Amino acid sequence: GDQRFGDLVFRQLAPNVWQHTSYLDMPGFGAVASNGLIVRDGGRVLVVDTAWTDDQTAQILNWIKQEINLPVALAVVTHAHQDKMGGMDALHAAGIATYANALSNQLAPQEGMVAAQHSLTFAANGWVEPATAPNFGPLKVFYPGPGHTSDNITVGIDGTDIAFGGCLIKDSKAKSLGNLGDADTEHYAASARAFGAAFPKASMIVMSHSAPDSRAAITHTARMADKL
Numbered sequence: 001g002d003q004r005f006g007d008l009v010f011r012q013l014a015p016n017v018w019q020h021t022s023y024l025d026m027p028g029f030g031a032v033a034s035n036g037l038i039v040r041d042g043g044r045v046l047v048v049d050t051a052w053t054d055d056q057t058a059q060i061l062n063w064i065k066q067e068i069n070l071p072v073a074l075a076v077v078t079h080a081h082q083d084k085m086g087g088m089d090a091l092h093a094a095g096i097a098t099y100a101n102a103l104s105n106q107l108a109p110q111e112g113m114v115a116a117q118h119s120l121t122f123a124a125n126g127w128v129e130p131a132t133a134p135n136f137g138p139l140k141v142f143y144p145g146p147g148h149t150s151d152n153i154t155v156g157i158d159g160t161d162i163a164f165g166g167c168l169i170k171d172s173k174a175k176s177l178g179n180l181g182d183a184d185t186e187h188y189a190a191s192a193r194a195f196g197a198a199f200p201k202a203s204m205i206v207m208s209h210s211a212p213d214s215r216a217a218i219t220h221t222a223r224m225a226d227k228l
């Protein structure tokens with residue numbers, strides 16, 4: 001179930017996949033959960049998204065050491081907001097190679113984040129240029145277009161039914177898309193549908209701010225984004 005480890009929560013989603021959850025008090029919204037992923041690929045571990053803070057991200061690494069006990073080969077972060085990139089310095093202090101969309105790295109300083117060490121770039125069709133994501137194993141990285149932010153990226157896990165929409169996708173019963181100050185209102189709806197079409201076999205949709213949901217999360221998020 002939900003394994004409490006300090007102030008974080010870990011949930012196993014598949015034999016080699018876990019969801020990490022961390023919380024930040026956001027004045028006005030309560031204590032906001034943010035989810036990322038941990039994937040074991042043979043003898044190494046891959047991380048998708050930091051926690052909100054360096055201290056929480058160090059706790060993710062401590063949980064990995066206790067429950068998996070294999071080296072963390074790399075982390076990929078899915079856009080330049082605090083819930084996804086707030087713990088970059090903890091990854092760097094641990095010697096972990098970090099990757100983000102080139103545009104996320106460009107935006108990181110003005111968003112108050114530390115950039116990742118390596119920049120991903122994407123083909124016209126949205127799939128990562130393979131030379132920019134070396135040794136990613138089962139992680140399949142896709143840029144669906146601007147939506148929640150201009151830089152948001154998404155990740156499928158080969159060998160599982162899981163795809164990660166990050167903060168682009170909301171659950172089946174969300175009422176709004178949240179803060180939209182950085183959003184691309186013209187393109188959001190198409191980007192959400194593009195994520196669904198890039199991972200057509202994924203039946204478990206993991207996202208930043210809700211528990212894992214069915215593909216109705218994608219259709220509902222798209223159906224909601226159609227209106228704007």
Ligand SMILES: C[C@H](CS)C(=O)N1CCC[C@H](C(=O)O)C1
Nearest residue numbers: 032081082083167177178179209
């Ligand atoms: C700090 C994050 C970066 S995505 C944020 O802005 N949030 C957290 C989730 C609830 C609100 C929403 O957008 O749904 C606002």
Ligand SMILES: [Zn+2]
Nearest residue numbers: 079081148167
């Ligand atoms: Zn965000």
Ligand SMILES: [Zn+2]
Nearest residue numbers: 081083167208
């Ligand atoms: Zn978010």
